[PDB]
Symmetry: D2
Subunit: 281 residues, 4 copies
């Protein structure tokens, strides 16, 4: 009935806050949907790492687009997709926006880091990020959600970050991704300043400490992101199975840690396929 | 050495060769890290990951894409599940050629009917020979065609051996003996078909779990663990999702997560920081 | 702010008849758009032949889907896409419909030939109904399913009309009447299967060439030109190759080439220099 | 038997010169093969324009890779692929090289223009192009051919261009693409200087005038490229058909300009498929 963008907007409005969980593939998206999340996330780092590449902007529009298409094919849950810095200049960004819309994506986030390579965290000038934003806004539909992400806190401090975010909003950004604020009591100031919904990145093993969804909502945050949480647990679990099989010559020890065949069928809605398989035959 | 040759060598040198399923490039790296000599792309995995049932709904491209991603990331010989060959003789030929181009080492193709009274229905022996011929006619020498027979459950051991033998005569390099229920069937079966035999040690099936050693002792050359890792990943993911949902934070899941440090190790990340300083 | 399906439906209603021209790629689609066509077509034979494969249903959903995506990315002109027999069973068909919708396609045509095999074999009417139901069950309202029948050559006009009518009852939006040999068959056929009918005006076929006007007069709503441009392109390409080979330079081919200026026009290149200064 | 790179190298050695013709798709490649060309070319501008995009480095590795795969799937004729500036930094370039190799490509050309610029044409510093080249060379196999392309003539003049090209060769470039030399008598100096095979770009409607293959070979050129010749003729022919159908309500007038159904079957080697259609 509603467009993906509209669904996302509605989820951000109704939830306090909206928890957005990362899913690396369609099946994970279904698991998340099953647990009752209202929005899901495609991590740029996830897309890269899953290919066995580092999160260094090596991936392009197609790497991400393919992963996004697979997910949106399997669920109507609004998906937020990480488009890094926009994969190139103004034309690439425009293409990215159009392609993500076509792929039934709800929202993207684009950040103000530098792209290019022939000192780690370097940002573009505010003006350049505005250029990026304008390129995106000029071709985007109304419903579709552009989240501008700023990486400025660690480098430039709270005031400079708020300044950027505000300029980004004026440039047409729908929502703001505030990367790695260190003090919970910075959020109320930040949220009040930028007016639009704010996303907080609750990734593990970062510089940021872990706050609860409730805590962050209390400090004015509208969205909480869990970008790699599931992926990290999956990787450990997979490694464990591999090690078990290798060391023991059989997977007996891994059996309690595996999802049952029954649960798999449930998630796939498998019985609905056997119903139509007999109704025609 | 070519991918096919590497697979052949792994089958010769290991007793037996354990082949573990990996759904994506990263899993393949984890498997490589643990020291496995061959990896596997599960057809059911390809489908289920897309959120589809394992009913031959996927086509050459669904599988090919997943295969390309893996072979891009590791030289470990990959066995790829091509179901029934995705169509007629021309489709099969295309599948073989594309998998070769994608640096795949081996495929397995089975003798079930395509998309079919519920059960397992098999094609006539002759039809499977046709499928095999289509594949063999375009395959290079090194590349490995494993013919898979699903006949045990339906037709019993003797009929299954008959098929497998015909498949070998039709040009099949190796045999995938699906769901033999008794360990003591293997020695008869392996001796009969002469070529290397793969046993499918999937969990939660009709088959019970035997060890690699046990199966090697009964004449088996390859043991397949098609979905083992995937199943554990799915449970772990669900747990994280449930934790975050119930508690509003992932604190409780933290002990169950791979460290950022281990991630960098697997990605060989330090090799990238080397070029990041050499240029600047 | 109309959906692709709605745009196609509107084009079929307003044109007498709607000419639908085949384009093998996005650029051809733009050329067609430029000339002023109201709908475009992605030929299954085109998709295959361009890959260097014969039109024998070797291609799958992805081969076609990729080519379709490229086109719809470049124009809003409603695109009709050939999905052969649906690429497999009921689940594959459902997937095909959903994926084509997602790819911003306006309409598909699916036919009643067998997948497996000097002649055409058809599926039983019931099997084609099954195919149609699979498609209809997941399709949106606006999206257009054209059922194609290959029955004329094999079974004759009456049997073909019977099938087409059953197909319409099964949920088909429109009918593709493949290879009717006589213009005077159409009025009977169109009146019988009350939905819009497409006529396939391919060259070098069994069918003779009638005009759009002639076919409209005989009750036809859509005329398809599936490979017309492609065939001319192939000859032109071969000619250039031969020129370069024989003469060591392409001087002789120059009058037969599109100017760089025209290329920029079609690509709307000036609109890119506009954004290059606006930022 | 021989690798794509080796085949290309052999074609460059044996032909005087090697004409390399652009083909936008697999079918065009077959037509070119049919006419008897020894090498074919995938134009970056072609890849973009066919999608309806301008040749402004908007396309990425995947846009080009897909088009390349389609072609190499259909013919073993060595394909030269335009990879623009390498689609990004050193890691992207490495990926591009590896992926093109995997896609059975014979050769790529990478140029010394900037990727993103200002707000006629800007080049990177020599050092940056060396960096690009090193990234490519470090992961490329021996057989595979890297052609370094310099766009420096128009901007910086012949001597500066020769200097660059020579540095590029020292950095590991196999061959040199000398874009838009305006005077035939520049080539002998240029070719002698940069001792490796040189490609001349005989595109129409450029700044360059049209010389013959023979003429260019006489001036020391090893390869002549015809990047968009076929494409341009195709576009005009297509437009004509569209206009005919639109204006006349039938395609009668276009019929003499169309390839016969018979010729199509010949090119597709269709009789080989009817052979298997009766063997089954
Ligand atoms: Cl990383
Ligand atoms: Cl699905
Ligand atoms: Cl504001
Ligand atoms: Cl399943
Ligand atoms: Cl990689
Ligand atoms: Cl034997
Ligand atoms: Cl054909
Ligand atoms: Cl476009
Ligand atoms: Cl009716
Ligand atoms: Cl252009
Ligand atoms: Cl082919
Ligand atoms: Cl030198
Ligand atoms: Mg990211
Ligand atoms: Mg399978
Ligand atoms: Mg067709
Ligand atoms: Mg180019």
């Amino acid at each position: 009935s509603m467009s993906p963008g509209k669904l996302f907007r509605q989820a951000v409005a109704n939830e306090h806050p909206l928890q957005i969980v990362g899913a690396i593939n369609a099946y994970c998206a279904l698991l998340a949907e099953n647990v009752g999340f209202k929005a899901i996330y495609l991590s740029g780092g996830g897309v890269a790492n899953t290919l066995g590449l580092p999160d260094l902007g090596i991936t392009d529009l197609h790497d991400v687009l393919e992963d996004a298409r697979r997910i949106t094919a399997a669920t109507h849950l609004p998906l937020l997709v990480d488009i890094d810095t926009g994969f190139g200049g103004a034309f690439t960004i425009a293409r990215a926006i159009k392609e993500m819309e076509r792929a039934q994506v709800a929202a993207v986030h684009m950040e103000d880091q530098v792209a290019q390579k022939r000192p780690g965290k370097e940002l573009v000038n505010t003006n350049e990020m505005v250029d990026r934003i304008k390129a995106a806004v000029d071709v985007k539909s109304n419903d579709f959600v552009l989240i501008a992400r700023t990486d400025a806190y660690a480098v430039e401090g709270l005031k400079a970050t708020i300044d950027r975010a505000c300029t980004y909003v004026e440039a047409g950004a729908d929502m703001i991704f505030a990367e790695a604020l260190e003090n919970i009591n910075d959020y109320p100031t930040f949220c009040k300043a930028v007016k639009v919904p704010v996303l907080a990145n609750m990734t593990e093993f970062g510089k940021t400490p872990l706050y609860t969804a409730a805590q962050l909502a209390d400090h004015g945050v509208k969205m909480v992101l869990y970008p790699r949480s599931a992926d990290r647990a999956m990787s450990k679990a997979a490694l464990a199975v591999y090690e078990d099989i290798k060391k023991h010559g059989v997977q007996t020890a891994s059996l309690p840690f595996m999802q049952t065949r029954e649960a798999l069928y449930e998630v796939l809605n498998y019985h609905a396929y056997e119903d139509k398989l007999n109704q025609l035959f």
